[model samples]
Target chain A: MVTAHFVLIHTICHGAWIWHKLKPALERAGHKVTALDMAASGIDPRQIEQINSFDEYSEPLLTFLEKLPQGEKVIIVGESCAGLNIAIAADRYVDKIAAGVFHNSLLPDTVHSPSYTVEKLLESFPDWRDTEYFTFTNITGETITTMKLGFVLLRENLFTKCTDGEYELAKMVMRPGSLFQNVLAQRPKFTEKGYGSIKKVYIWTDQDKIFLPDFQRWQIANYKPDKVYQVQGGDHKLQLTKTEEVAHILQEVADAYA
Target chain B: MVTAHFVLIHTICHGAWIWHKLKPALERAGHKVTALDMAASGIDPRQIEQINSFDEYSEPLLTFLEKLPQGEKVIIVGESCAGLNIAIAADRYVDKIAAGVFHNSLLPDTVHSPSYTVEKLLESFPDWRDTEYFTFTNITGETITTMKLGFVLLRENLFTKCTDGEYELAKMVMRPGSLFQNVLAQRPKFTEKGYGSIKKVYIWTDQDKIFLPDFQRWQIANYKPDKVYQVQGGDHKLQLTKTEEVAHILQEVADAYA
Candidate 1:
């Protein structure tokens, strides 16, 4: 079994394409890159049909780790919610993962229940519940269609400045049921000692709207990464819009670890 | 252990909040809600420091599955890239999952490599590479602050109609990365017999920007979902803006399965 040298996972409601622009950048930097599909993401629709629980959604990465090559060290990258997966994987397979990198991730200070964190974030967001853009449903759960204005909003609060093509592409690739049921899983706790042992990096998109600047700062402080890099021009969709820049950063991170 | 429950997983850059409006609708109609969060998304951010690869991002969801009460069937719902993780988990714990649901998702037919999905989607987009609405950097990647004027033109081609806040929200959350690296994993091939044994549902958003209506129709034709529901409005970010509508649909599906 060949141990993965590098791995990339996308955020919620996204596929591996979230990292599409960064692949060339990483390869150009001379590092092996592995963009991965988590659970039912990407082109795999079976996940939704077959995977019924949180544990079922995470088996791909764990199984991959168990089968990794003996001697190679791996770097696990997570964006947005995938950040939790990376940390747990790092904890479970500390020997294999070289480092964990988070980009505009959500890191709560405590390992409480999902409700706690969700409530907290909502509290912080201004009139979050009142946002009229949402559409509540009876069977399929919550999903956004076109807003009251009749135009469908495909961007995830981060691609405002993106070209029409970029937005269109995003709309074409977006998925549904990205949010389902309630997140009832208990938070995983990692000792600072264990976390400290692993190399950590935080990529902050200055203009990010979903994971806003204040929240980003809070997450960074809680995680206490070894280094923090700033993406100035791109929004949360930087990986798609600014492939070269994203690749450069990944290269730098890889080089520092290597 | 919860027996015979419904577990829903969102995609990258989204939180369980996406299900807020939907969960209530599902529950009111009498369906258990189990929304799982990926690593740093929604509420957990501690993993951000350690995320460096994709497999790691999938670990959390997998671990959650292994710890479930066991013996209960679950319906795995994945939107977008969350499908990747959900697929692996479904295979690993085939017996535990009862059904899968993909909403405006990307299937193998849509694109070959993850990068191709983005490239193809953005082909018609204008000025995608050289936009100024985003901030660029050497270390972090691209970050967005506002939407570009091209959005109007792009919206016409990508989706039908949405609210101003919906448009702005989508623009504010874009992140940058490699398109190719995002699709390094293989697409699973299931035998006809195996495919026949599982239950699946595909919800197509009529106004979705990411997954075009034509693509959605193609997926329905090939996947043969147990049920197909058409949503009139909302784009990719519908989970947040239109949770109630989505939740209702999720509940309807879960109830049918239950």
Candidate 2:
């Protein structure tokens, strides 16, 4: 199998730590991997109140893509709300990407507002128990809302299938994140030359509690991917719960997309 | 073994992750283990440049201790430079600590300046080849020095015996760290009623490459601890290399200290 470079991005309130298991498993398959803590997320030293827009939050990915040498394109793998990051990256650095892999993640498209998937997500699974939200001004002096996903939602939904240590660590490092909803709505759409040309693959499981089944299906229906691999088990964090299986799928992505 | 609340502190440039193996190992023995991310380290969402002093960097540990109920005591297990963290916490929250365990860590004394142990450590093991250093103005407008640990020192010295995943994760999360030497020297010494009254246990091995034999021996000579558990083998990160053995030692510490 051809070795591929995989860049992994985390969902809201999450950092590169979420990819701890998946990065190693992929490396064992002889693939090159890089997991980035997006701006203001993880321990990246920036906070939500200081950041202006979703594009600024997606800086790490764009900066990484900008540094890639010509003719070297990587497959970006994003989870949950990180799909918006991939769309933003593709719009700017499309020439540097081989594919975009959505792992039980949000899927952004060029057809509608940038916040469409996020809106649909809430409409399908709206109950966020005790997760608090606050607003901050972006770079252009625009107000943006950020959230802190509370323990009950974390313990009950996202990490249902994960081990105690995994759950404990999530509680240890999780920081506040933003949907960048309104700000993203005011932004330009993903272009055909960039995001539209790249291969899109959706990997999902029926048991994702937070990002419900209908929401995942709706994403596929709204923005069709080049391929869809439905795993019978695994929760929202398939990388932790089903590491080997996710690695196998990533390997297939490496081969097929290469 | 009696149940004890064990708070694990990571070494400089590392997060709560270094104790990932030990936390579960201790928990399996019916102990409650809490691992924390210090300021500007791991995914703490703060950078070293933004921090003014070492005491400011130890905010998370101090904050956690403040929230503990009256008469609640926990044994603090620190690694490498994290011994300094235990000393700082002890100075403020002495009544809340049952014991301070130095696992191949720095041992602070009440005699001279706060940066004494760090100064001695540099004299004993000054060879940090390729590790880069920089400086930035802290919150008080005073310049604080920081360093980004180079890969050579990380792979060869610190993580010589760790698995690839552990090493990768270390690189993935590690941020710039400061010794806070100059700032600590200007601060007051640890009080007799606080850090002086607590039990201290030193856990180490001679095989540790970064924190060498002479430095460990020198620390023991400088300020003797209540107990010292020296295993025959295992790298600097004994929690990863000798999990069960270290757990047994910790069990004995728990029983003896309790």
Candidate 3:
């Protein structure tokens, strides 16, 4: 198989650690993989309360791309809420991203509403109030939101198909999510000459309860991706449950596009 | 520090993958580490339903020890349920184990009761019915119990300090646990000249919820290990979250005993 550089972006409430399984799998297959931690997440020492905007939250990822050698193109794979980040990255670094792959993720359509997504999530989980999800007024009196997920939300929404030990380690390293405002903000404008020019692939997970199959299909229909790959028995967290399958699909996309 | 050959034993529903983080940490410190999967867990292809007894389930671990060079004493570290396996191994091959370290693990005491443990677990979580805990009768009408944990039980009980991504991959490789009957069975007797002769160390995780601090203290009071090392904010799965801490403790124990 041809070797390609793959950059992995994790969802909101997650960091680079999400790619633990798939990173090694890809590397073992001779592909170079870089799993990035967005600002304030993973091992980054920044407190969630310090992050004020999406741009600030994503500065780390942007800086990483900027540091790469000029003309170095990579296969960019985004998970969950990171699809928007991938789109934004692709728009800004069109020359650097060979292809953008969304794995059971959300899209950057102009009509996207973060509040609606949160509402839907809350509706699906009536006991959201009982969970660690909460909001507080910051020093500026603006209501800031953050989510310190407990096991229930993680298992039911994200890791339905995961094992206990896997869930344990994942929950341990999870930072309180502080990018709700960014996710709820207006979608960034991407030029047709930029992000639109990049080849796109969607890896759909059939059993995902969080990003339900209907939403996945809707994203595919609206975005009109170059290729669509389907995986059975994969949850919202396919990077964990189906690493080999996700890696294989990414490799297939890399072969065709990157 | 002495460079000891370390053999890691994983807990129920886990395989060698549980040591993915800690094995490298130990090896990087100049020690040789071997992480093994029990018969039906981890990446082992054995069918859990096909294994009829504890012996069948533990054959792989036993075989690994049997194949080691004669008179080559190695440091054995057991996490969670593997504590019993370590004791069994220590009993059978006293000369092969330089020292046995239990990290947030269950002790092989005569007073240990599987039914009581299950009942306590169920009582602790009144909503156990909502989780994936279940039991079924085999073809021969023998009641076989198994647990396929989702992220919640894992995060809360095991990996309270782990990253979401770590939990994800760990969950992916988890196998269904079928050793409840074995765990509930009568305690095995070890000669004071055999297993008792091997040095023992207990590494306690203060933040552990599965084997709570109270239970850990109780074990320590009754068993009276040679040394006790305490981790202030570690969860049950410290091998993943507190890899460095666990490795350092293991090294310290090796220096004293191995």
Candidate 4:
């Protein structure tokens, strides 16, 4: 029996709890899996409360990489904004990683920064906004706050595709994002490191609203990844809702890495 | 000699100049047409520079409708983000508009806003900055900005597909976008007052990046326009390069409107 471990990282504003749907499926595949909530999300809401720095988040992943067994590789999957953090992790511990997969995630390239890619998207569609009932936790105190996004800023950068139900959810769950400062300040420095030497796979969602198909194609085409997988009828969080399909794809990537 | 007019409007972050290629072909067809920049773009960069509020940008079209001559009714074509604006224009100037055409544009019903539709867009991709290049004139002088988007905002949104070159061009021409704010804020407030009254024809760009095929189907199903037109290649901004084909379709819309 092949013993391989899978490390799943959640996107910004999310806790490990988001993986509740996929964890069982992954575990049933006979693989060891650990879904992390990062510093400020889920149970560790106050992780970034007092810390005004971004390194606190990046350091944990690096530390985790160092402790892995020698000659054994772990597959890292970064969804949404976590793609950046995962890249940092892979660059620091290239040897411990068998491959890296970014699901509908940003791959900051040499010519452009991740923020720049996002800025372009916001301008295309003006009416997009954060949904109602969205939740976010203070990294330090774990205090979750919710509010409607400012109109001007709402049009400036969009992450999710706009929908009524989504709007309701965003209004309910969205809290101020700590990564806003972190991503802005550190993206340039980290982007310089590139994808490291790990095998990269970009999973493109055909039905994605924020990234859209063309932008997705542009991101994948420009990055020149080792492989690409297309996910049909999935939102950004499809891995959560459609765990079996994501696992099947993960299996392919894992087998190839093996 | 046959007389036909083809008028095209660009979506958000796009100017009337996008109809550059199609302009010549339609004029050659002996059709007297005018492709005016909607308030804050193209040759009227001054308007974009001088506008104090969103109302100022929308007033020009309203004024145009009041002065329009009684004729066979002109064919008004909109690309991508221009759906709402075009509908508003057609509603006020019903006699001047023979028929309305939406090219991968928004069509939010009374029950929802465009943000409501787009919020459902997938949240797995990186940030986009193309809309920042949109230069507009405001009380703060000629300023440019980008929109901030998230998956929570775009979950149920739709977008058109475009080519690599078009995607690159969108990136290259990134500027400040007020068009997005103007339309998005007004979407919910406007209702179906003037929208449902006008006859509509939707043009689908098969390879569009902004509006996907599924979303287009959704739009058609929801609106049930008088007719549907399909183009095999290009993205949302195809009117800029694929002018002749777009013009040909415009002729058809004009014929149908009569």
The reply for model 1, stretches above 4 Å from the true place, is: A1-4, A47-49, A108-119, A126-153, A177-188, A191-196, B1-258
* Candidate 4: segments with Cα more than 4 A from true spot: A1-3, A45-49, A110-176, A181-194, B1-258
> Per-residue lDDT for B79-147 in model 2, tens only?
999988998999999889999999999999998788999898899889898899988886677677788
DockQ of candidate 4 is 0.01
Highest lDDT model number: 2
Better of 1 and 2 by TM-score: 2
- Better model by lDDT: candidate 1 vs candidate 2: 2
What's the C-alpha lDDT at position A151 in model 1? 19
lDDT of 1 by residue, B127-209 (tens): 44333343222123422122232455334433236443334323333222221233233333432333335577777676776
Candidate 3 chain A: worst-modelled 10 consecutive residues by lDDT: A114-123
Q: List the residue pairs that clash in candidate 2.
A: A52-A138, A52-A139
Error of 3 at B193 (Å): 30
State which candidate has the highest DockQ: 2
Candidate 2's displacement at residue B162, Å, is 2.4
Q: Global CA lDDT of candidate 4, please?
A: 0.58
Error of 2 at A238 (Å): 2.1
Rank the models by DockQ, top first.
Answer: 2, 3, 1, 4
Comparing to the true complex, what docking class would candidate 2 get?
A: medium
Against the native chain B, each candidate's TM-score is 0.67, 0.97, 0.88, 0.72
Q: What is candidate 2's lDDT per residue for A1-258, written digit by digit as tens?
A: 878999999997899989888898999999999999998887787777877788889998889998899999799999999999999999898888989999989898888888888889989888899799888776777788888998989988899888866777787778899988888878888888888789999999999988888889989999899999998877889988998999999899889988
lDDT of each residue in A122-177, candidate 3, tens digit only:
45435542347667665446667787776677878788888655565465456677
Query: What would the per-residue lDDT of candidate 3 be over residues B142-195, giving only the tens digit for each residue?
Result: 677777766677767777778755665655455577655633464356557766
For candidate 3 chain B, the 10 contiguous residues with the lowest summed lDDT are B113-122
C-alpha positional error of residue A123 in candidate 1 after TM-score superposition, expressed in Å: 3.3
Candidate 1 docks with a DockQ of: 0.02
DockQ for each of the predicted structures, in order? 0.02, 0.51, 0.05, 0.01
Q: What are the candidates' interface root-mean-square deviations?
A: 14.1, 2.2, 13.5, 20.9
